[PDB]
Amino acid sequence: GSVEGAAFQSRLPHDRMTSQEAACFPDIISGPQQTQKVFLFIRNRTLQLWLDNPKIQLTFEATLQQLEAPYNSDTVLVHRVHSYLERHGLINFGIYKRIKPL
């Protein structure tokens, strides 16, 4: 990219509706304003809680207990967001597995 003067860890906006995330989630951007809001808010809070250095590995369970809103009450929403994020390739040397010794 022909730009310089800014350098950060993540590669996403601060609370804005971009096509970048929506390209992996066509049903969300073609959905109502509540759906893109909950999906974006979770996905941002997730990647923040991951990069914030929690312990060893951040999980859906560690996300769900940190966030204090009815937004996270849909477990399937969080599990989808996480599953896609890991598979999408956001500099993830690890793979979606348990924390336990296996």
The CA-CA-CA angle for residues 37, 40, 70, to 5°, reads 60
3 burial (CB, 10 Å; 0-12 / 13-18 / 19+) is exposed
Q: Which one is the CATH code of 1-102: 1.10.10.10, 3.10.290.10, 3.40.50.920, 1.10.3720.10?
A: 1.10.10.10
Per-domain boundaries in the chain: 1-102
Number of Cβ atoms within 10 Å of the Cβ of 93: 4
**Distance from C-alpha of 46 to C-alpha of 64, rounded to nearest angstrom:** 9
Q: How was this structure determined?
A: NMR
